[PDB]
């Protein structure tokens, strides 16, 4: 066996038996290297079969390791460049051993964001602050084609939530996108979700500005006025001074005039107004999200799909309440099936075909790319799992595989 | 015999020779003929002040109306001018039918003011953009001048001025050009919808604001400062509704997608954004007032109307409280609740007009009986039946006959009314 230490950039070849557990090898590593350091975090990684040495209690043989195998001793927590929905990169170190689902959970607990199951990871202080862009040129610089096929192509980058980061080709300090994957936001509470709402509003703002989602001019002007309103509401949160021609003594009962001087009353009102503006700021972003949620093209994830009796590449669209057969160019809905009528769905991994069973004996089938099937399967099962909130074991189970919809009405 | 009639608007007294078999319309005809004038008598109607009744039934004879000889009645236009003080404390002149029952008068007024659900409002005796805009006073001096005694007995005295919704203004000693208060009478507001109730919400907010500023309702210092902060915020949001100019350090072009930079100039964008911003601030304005109201609704002493009453085993004049869902026996010195009765457990309630006594029958055959003043008896009766009628409101056109049936009392459209919402 050969174990490569990435940190010290040195490879160690060891004499291995086969009756010594994985922990024994790790222990032998600590003693032999003759270096005063901390090895507590590191874990063995197998690049060949792309599996972690998860259980260190296991011996050598029941892991299926041949002779002269080149293992890797690398730290679990590596540098990871994350781009928040606010399009600002933050540097964090997360566990590359845990499942992406549990990884997202930890990241959101760190970022003060409730319900991490609505979020996931996607390939390519200031958590609460939201400000517009310095100049229109930056938007044009960030401007992408954002066509349906281009958007559908980027949807392949959704990580397997049942696997880890290391198993899915994620290098150290490689850019991953933290995005709201599912568009079923349960319990948006301004009392707890000051950051959660802010990032969701940011994702909605950037999706509209970069024309990732299509809307009319009237709606565009409204959204533009909304974040203008949000900007003015934000300024009020910092202001600790009188800004209008109103005398604060006119806003209170005359008994407090005898209890306080004017400077005292002005101070307590300004302090309270910062709290008032703080809630108005949040509820404003709430309205932005509401208007965003009410768009006719909201909450649809596109995947290239081949439908029965179709000679052209089309699109399968996945939403929180339905899935849609769509036109690849226009994006017009050909037919819409709803999740409330679904009994179960099947996934043939050989043919790469998804078959969905609905009520009243209607049946849908389509075919996708190899990578898309796993992503679509997780998208489907994920959306059903989110329709049951009122349990991590439930999610992993829902995500030739056959899964019965636990919310079938019929 | 002879009939003397005074035409109010013409300032003329007319004597008419009548028998008694002459119809009401007959008097009106002989009145017009003898005057010999060219005028529109459409709105004019006979009024008898001594007996406080309109004489609208034209087909009736003088015998049916019990009009004795030498009676001096009036021929006056039904619609007269009235001064109303809105919940925003601003006065306004309106023309209303002084022969219509107050309940209809209030509804017509609310229709004019574009206020939905007029059954929650009514007129109270004093002890177009004026309806929409909210503005704080100029100085603390104004608040000090309007500061009236808010003691519980003083509020109980004020509540004697609530007009009978089953009778008309003329029948209740309300002269032309006099001042009446338009207030939210019942504290149970059905469907406060911001999409329609911009005026309704504004006035309700004003009534809440003024009740707090004049200490008509109690609140903690923390709550008071929060209410003050809300006012400051609402005033600021109100300013934004008029602003048609940039007031921040943000470029409006960074708020739109790049395709609009190719279609519009910088000014065309800034203008259409500010135009939309006024509507955004408008909605924020309404939502801010809603938060003020719901906070006002959550106050411990909210939604209670007080009346002086003597109870069965009382040693004193006490206070009977009427909330939206309950009757409360309160001490008139501390305002503490002695005993509370739920409306849901009320099978029935009676009003003995002779002894001026109200008796309520409950479940488990528990009984409550108290005595008020002559005026308070019908006012309290309307409050009980009114709040009940409000409970019959479903999300599904108001049933006027139902409202009167619950609140008319001794007026036709010992009184006994069965609660239609008696649970079990």
Short mmCIF file of C-alpha atoms in Angstrom, two decimals, chain B residues 64-380:
data_model
loop_
_atom_site.label_atom_id
_atom_site.label_comp_id
_atom_site.label_asym_id
_atom_site.label_seq_id
_atom_site.Cartn_x
_atom_site.Cartn_y
_atom_site.Cartn_z
CA UNK B 64 -104.86 57.66 11.14
CA UNK B 65 -101.98 59.96 12.09
CA UNK B 66 -103.83 61.04 15.22
CA UNK B 67 -103.34 64.71 14.37
CA UNK B 68 -105.50 66.68 16.79
CA UNK B 69 -106.76 70.20 16.08
CA UNK B 70 -104.51 73.28 16.14
CA UNK B 71 -101.42 71.16 15.48
CA UNK B 72 -98.39 73.05 14.17
CA UNK B 73 -96.26 70.90 11.86
CA UNK B 74 -93.63 71.70 9.23
CA UNK B 75 -93.15 71.23 5.50
CA UNK B 76 -89.40 70.82 5.03
CA UNK B 77 -86.94 69.24 2.56
CA UNK B 78 -85.78 65.78 3.65
CA UNK B 79 -82.16 66.26 2.58
CA UNK B 80 -80.28 68.73 4.78
CA UNK B 81 -76.65 69.73 5.34
CA UNK B 82 -74.67 67.95 8.05
CA UNK B 83 -71.16 68.45 9.44
CA UNK B 84 -69.25 65.21 10.01
CA UNK B 85 -65.98 64.90 11.90
CA UNK B 86 -64.09 62.01 10.31
CA UNK B 87 -61.92 59.66 12.42
CA UNK B 88 -59.01 61.85 11.23
CA UNK B 89 -60.59 64.64 13.31
CA UNK B 90 -61.24 66.74 10.19
CA UNK B 91 -64.75 68.10 9.60
CA UNK B 92 -66.66 67.79 6.32
CA UNK B 93 -70.03 68.98 4.97
CA UNK B 94 -72.45 66.45 3.48
CA UNK B 95 -76.08 66.27 2.38
CA UNK B 96 -78.07 63.44 3.96
CA UNK B 97 -81.69 62.31 4.15
CA UNK B 98 -83.00 63.31 7.58
CA UNK B 99 -85.97 60.97 7.14
CA UNK B 100 -83.97 57.83 6.33
CA UNK B 101 -83.10 55.52 9.21
CA UNK B 102 -79.57 56.24 10.46
CA UNK B 103 -78.42 52.77 9.37
CA UNK B 104 -79.18 53.66 5.75
CA UNK B 105 -77.82 57.19 6.15
CA UNK B 106 -74.48 55.82 7.35
CA UNK B 107 -74.35 53.37 4.43
CA UNK B 108 -75.05 56.11 1.88
CA UNK B 109 -72.40 58.30 3.52
CA UNK B 110 -69.88 55.46 3.45
CA UNK B 111 -70.72 54.80 -0.21
CA UNK B 112 -69.94 58.45 -0.95
CA UNK B 113 -66.70 58.25 1.04
CA UNK B 114 -65.92 54.91 -0.63
CA UNK B 115 -65.87 53.10 2.71
CA UNK B 116 -66.78 49.41 2.58
CA UNK B 117 -68.82 47.72 5.32
CA UNK B 118 -70.74 50.70 6.78
CA UNK B 119 -72.37 48.45 9.40
CA UNK B 120 -69.17 48.75 11.43
CA UNK B 121 -69.61 52.52 11.55
CA UNK B 122 -72.28 54.88 12.90
CA UNK B 123 -72.93 58.46 14.00
CA UNK B 124 -72.04 59.82 17.43
CA UNK B 125 -73.25 63.01 19.12
CA UNK B 126 -70.59 65.45 20.29
CA UNK B 127 -70.45 65.37 24.12
CA UNK B 128 -62.20 63.95 -1.58
CA UNK B 129 -58.52 63.90 -0.64
CA UNK B 130 -59.51 64.74 2.93
CA UNK B 131 -60.52 61.09 3.32
CA UNK B 132 -57.26 59.57 2.09
CA UNK B 133 -54.27 61.63 3.27
CA UNK B 134 -52.79 61.14 6.74
CA UNK B 135 -50.69 63.90 8.31
CA UNK B 136 -49.32 64.44 11.85
CA UNK B 137 -50.22 67.64 13.72
CA UNK B 138 -48.08 70.77 13.57
CA UNK B 139 -47.30 71.11 17.29
CA UNK B 140 -47.70 69.40 20.70
CA UNK B 141 -50.00 72.32 21.54
CA UNK B 142 -52.69 70.83 19.29
CA UNK B 143 -52.62 67.55 21.21
CA UNK B 144 -52.85 69.40 24.52
CA UNK B 145 -55.87 71.41 23.38
CA UNK B 146 -57.76 68.31 22.25
CA UNK B 147 -56.95 66.41 25.44
CA UNK B 148 -60.34 65.56 26.95
CA UNK B 149 -60.98 63.62 30.20
CA UNK B 150 -60.65 59.95 29.26
CA UNK B 151 -61.81 58.51 32.59
CA UNK B 152 -63.97 55.40 32.19
CA UNK B 153 -67.06 57.25 33.42
CA UNK B 154 -66.40 60.03 30.90
CA UNK B 155 -66.23 57.49 28.07
CA UNK B 156 -69.42 55.92 29.41
CA UNK B 157 -71.05 59.34 29.21
CA UNK B 158 -69.82 59.80 25.64
CA UNK B 159 -71.35 56.47 24.60
CA UNK B 160 -74.80 57.87 25.41
CA UNK B 161 -74.57 59.81 22.16
CA UNK B 162 -74.64 56.83 19.79
CA UNK B 163 -77.59 57.42 17.47
CA UNK B 164 -80.46 54.97 17.01
CA UNK B 165 -79.89 53.20 13.69
CA UNK B 166 -83.61 52.38 13.46
CA UNK B 167 -84.77 56.01 13.62
CA UNK B 168 -83.87 59.11 11.60
CA UNK B 169 -81.71 62.15 12.38
CA UNK B 170 -84.74 64.44 12.62
CA UNK B 171 -86.32 62.22 15.28
CA UNK B 172 -83.20 62.33 17.44
CA UNK B 173 -82.80 66.08 18.02
CA UNK B 174 -80.32 66.57 15.17
CA UNK B 175 -80.74 69.96 13.51
CA UNK B 176 -79.34 71.06 10.14
CA UNK B 177 -75.68 72.12 9.94
CA UNK B 178 -74.99 70.52 13.34
CA UNK B 179 -71.84 68.47 13.94
CA UNK B 180 -71.86 64.69 14.30
CA UNK B 181 -69.02 62.21 14.72
CA UNK B 182 -68.41 59.47 12.18
CA UNK B 183 -66.70 56.68 14.12
CA UNK B 184 -66.04 52.97 13.90
CA UNK B 185 -68.67 51.79 16.37
CA UNK B 186 -67.96 48.06 16.46
CA UNK B 187 -64.44 46.68 16.79
CA UNK B 188 -64.90 43.70 14.46
CA UNK B 189 -63.62 44.57 10.99
CA UNK B 190 -64.61 42.16 8.22
CA UNK B 191 -62.12 41.75 5.37
CA UNK B 192 -59.68 44.65 5.62
CA UNK B 193 -58.60 44.42 1.99
CA UNK B 194 -55.84 46.89 0.95
CA UNK B 195 -56.85 46.47 -2.70
CA UNK B 196 -60.08 48.39 -2.11
CA UNK B 197 -60.04 49.87 1.39
CA UNK B 198 -57.43 52.62 0.99
CA UNK B 199 -59.87 55.09 2.55
CA UNK B 200 -61.39 52.61 5.01
CA UNK B 201 -57.96 51.59 6.33
CA UNK B 202 -56.75 55.20 6.49
CA UNK B 203 -59.63 56.35 8.67
CA UNK B 204 -59.49 53.26 10.89
CA UNK B 205 -55.78 53.95 11.34
CA UNK B 206 -56.59 57.58 12.15
CA UNK B 207 -59.14 56.54 14.77
CA UNK B 208 -56.50 54.26 16.28
CA UNK B 209 -53.79 56.93 16.16
CA UNK B 210 -55.93 59.61 17.81
CA UNK B 211 -57.25 57.24 20.48
CA UNK B 212 -53.64 56.59 21.48
CA UNK B 213 -52.46 60.20 21.18
CA UNK B 214 -55.34 61.44 23.33
CA UNK B 215 -54.89 58.47 25.68
CA UNK B 216 -58.39 57.10 25.09
CA UNK B 217 -56.70 53.70 25.26
CA UNK B 218 -53.75 52.63 27.41
CA UNK B 219 -50.39 51.27 26.26
CA UNK B 220 -46.88 50.71 27.62
CA UNK B 221 -44.06 53.19 26.99
CA UNK B 222 -42.44 50.60 24.72
CA UNK B 223 -45.68 50.31 22.74
CA UNK B 224 -46.12 54.09 22.66
CA UNK B 225 -42.66 54.64 21.17
CA UNK B 226 -43.36 51.86 18.66
CA UNK B 227 -46.61 53.59 17.69
CA UNK B 228 -44.65 56.83 17.40
CA UNK B 229 -42.07 55.08 15.22
CA UNK B 230 -44.85 53.73 13.02
CA UNK B 231 -46.28 57.24 12.57
CA UNK B 232 -42.84 58.54 11.61
CA UNK B 233 -42.47 55.67 9.14
CA UNK B 234 -45.95 56.17 7.69
CA UNK B 235 -45.26 59.89 7.23
CA UNK B 236 -42.03 59.07 5.41
CA UNK B 237 -43.75 56.52 3.18
CA UNK B 238 -46.39 59.16 2.49
CA UNK B 239 -43.70 61.58 1.31
CA UNK B 240 -42.39 59.00 -1.17
CA UNK B 241 -45.83 58.80 -2.80
CA UNK B 242 -45.43 62.37 -4.05
CA UNK B 243 -41.71 62.29 -4.84
CA UNK B 244 -41.09 62.31 -8.59
CA UNK B 245 -37.35 62.94 -8.31
CA UNK B 246 -34.24 60.92 -7.43
CA UNK B 247 -33.41 61.08 -3.73
CA UNK B 248 -30.67 58.46 -3.39
CA UNK B 249 -27.18 57.66 -4.68
CA UNK B 250 -28.44 54.80 -6.86
CA UNK B 251 -28.46 54.79 -10.66
CA UNK B 252 -31.92 53.72 -11.94
CA UNK B 253 -30.21 52.06 -14.92
CA UNK B 254 -28.69 49.45 -12.60
CA UNK B 255 -32.21 48.36 -11.63
CA UNK B 256 -33.25 47.09 -15.07
CA UNK B 257 -32.12 44.47 -17.58
CA UNK B 258 -29.71 45.69 -20.31
CA UNK B 259 -32.35 45.39 -23.07
CA UNK B 260 -34.14 48.47 -21.71
CA UNK B 261 -30.98 50.56 -21.91
CA UNK B 262 -31.19 50.02 -25.66
CA UNK B 263 -34.87 50.98 -25.82
CA UNK B 264 -35.03 53.97 -23.47
CA UNK B 265 -32.95 57.01 -22.57
CA UNK B 266 -31.75 57.50 -18.99
CA UNK B 267 -34.60 59.94 -18.32
CA UNK B 268 -37.29 57.67 -19.80
CA UNK B 269 -36.13 54.94 -17.42
CA UNK B 270 -35.84 57.19 -14.37
CA UNK B 271 -39.33 58.56 -15.02
CA UNK B 272 -41.11 55.23 -15.49
CA UNK B 273 -39.36 53.80 -12.43
CA UNK B 274 -40.36 56.75 -10.24
CA UNK B 275 -43.89 56.40 -11.60
CA UNK B 276 -43.96 52.78 -10.46
CA UNK B 277 -42.24 53.69 -7.19
CA UNK B 278 -45.16 55.90 -6.17
CA UNK B 279 -47.44 52.87 -6.40
CA UNK B 280 -44.92 50.76 -4.48
CA UNK B 281 -44.74 53.37 -1.72
CA UNK B 282 -48.54 53.58 -1.83
CA UNK B 283 -48.84 49.88 -1.02
CA UNK B 284 -46.14 50.16 1.65
CA UNK B 285 -48.12 53.07 3.07
CA UNK B 286 -51.27 50.97 3.40
CA UNK B 287 -49.38 47.97 4.77
CA UNK B 288 -47.72 50.20 7.37
CA UNK B 289 -51.11 51.47 8.55
CA UNK B 290 -52.30 47.86 8.73
CA UNK B 291 -49.45 47.00 11.11
CA UNK B 292 -50.46 50.01 13.22
CA UNK B 293 -54.06 48.78 13.40
CA UNK B 294 -53.24 45.15 14.22
CA UNK B 295 -50.92 46.34 16.99
CA UNK B 296 -53.76 48.52 18.24
CA UNK B 297 -56.01 45.45 18.06
CA UNK B 298 -53.62 43.47 20.27
CA UNK B 299 -53.71 45.99 23.12
CA UNK B 300 -55.16 44.50 26.35
CA UNK B 301 -57.89 47.14 26.71
CA UNK B 302 -58.89 47.19 23.03
CA UNK B 303 -62.43 46.89 21.70
CA UNK B 304 -64.50 47.61 24.80
CA UNK B 305 -67.42 50.03 24.99
CA UNK B 306 -68.47 51.13 28.48
CA UNK B 307 -71.89 51.95 29.94
CA UNK B 308 -72.90 52.92 33.48
CA UNK B 309 -75.00 50.15 35.03
CA UNK B 310 -76.34 48.85 38.33
CA UNK B 311 -76.17 45.07 38.72
CA UNK B 312 -78.23 42.59 40.76
CA UNK B 313 -76.12 42.52 43.93
CA UNK B 314 -74.29 45.79 43.44
CA UNK B 315 -73.48 48.45 46.02
CA UNK B 316 -72.61 50.99 43.37
CA UNK B 317 -72.86 52.36 39.86
CA UNK B 318 -70.61 50.08 37.83
CA UNK B 319 -69.68 49.53 34.19
CA UNK B 320 -71.13 47.04 31.73
CA UNK B 321 -68.59 46.38 28.99
CA UNK B 322 -69.50 45.26 25.49
CA UNK B 323 -66.78 43.58 23.44
CA UNK B 324 -67.23 41.81 20.11
CA UNK B 325 -67.65 38.40 21.74
CA UNK B 326 -68.60 39.10 25.35
CA UNK B 327 -70.31 41.20 28.01
CA UNK B 328 -68.13 42.39 30.89
CA UNK B 329 -69.01 43.58 34.39
CA UNK B 330 -66.39 46.18 35.29
CA UNK B 331 -65.59 48.26 38.35
CA UNK B 332 -66.08 51.94 37.52
CA UNK B 333 -63.09 52.94 39.65
CA UNK B 334 -60.36 50.51 38.56
CA UNK B 335 -61.62 49.20 35.23
CA UNK B 336 -61.01 45.66 36.46
CA UNK B 337 -63.27 42.92 35.12
CA UNK B 338 -65.53 41.48 37.82
CA UNK B 339 -67.18 38.85 35.62
CA UNK B 340 -67.30 38.02 31.91
CA UNK B 341 -70.09 36.45 29.85
CA UNK B 342 -69.45 34.97 26.40
CA UNK B 343 -71.87 35.78 23.57
CA UNK B 344 -71.65 32.16 22.39
CA UNK B 345 -73.28 30.96 25.61
CA UNK B 346 -76.13 33.47 25.31
CA UNK B 347 -79.46 31.87 24.32
CA UNK B 348 -81.51 35.05 24.67
CA UNK B 349 -81.67 38.55 26.12
CA UNK B 350 -84.61 40.75 27.13
CA UNK B 351 -85.15 44.48 27.57
CA UNK B 352 -87.78 45.73 30.01
CA UNK B 353 -88.38 49.30 28.86
CA UNK B 354 -90.44 50.03 31.97
CA UNK B 355 -87.86 49.22 34.65
CA UNK B 356 -85.12 50.07 32.14
CA UNK B 357 -83.65 46.63 32.83
CA UNK B 358 -81.70 44.33 30.52
CA UNK B 359 -81.80 40.60 31.30
CA UNK B 360 -79.60 38.02 29.57
CA UNK B 361 -80.28 34.28 29.57
CA UNK B 362 -77.29 31.95 29.20
CA UNK B 363 -76.46 28.25 28.96
CA UNK B 364 -76.76 26.21 32.17
CA UNK B 365 -79.64 28.64 32.77
CA UNK B 366 -77.24 31.18 34.28
CA UNK B 367 -78.77 34.66 34.43
CA UNK B 368 -77.56 38.25 34.18
CA UNK B 369 -79.67 41.36 34.75
CA UNK B 370 -78.77 45.05 35.10
CA UNK B 371 -80.28 48.54 34.84
CA UNK B 372 -79.14 51.53 32.77
CA UNK B 373 -80.47 55.02 32.05
CA UNK B 374 -83.42 55.67 29.73
CA UNK B 375 -81.22 56.46 26.73
CA UNK B 376 -78.56 53.81 27.41
CA UNK B 377 -81.10 50.97 27.32
CA UNK B 378 -81.67 51.17 23.57
CA UNK B 379 -78.05 52.09 22.86
CA UNK B 380 -76.82 49.01 24.73
#
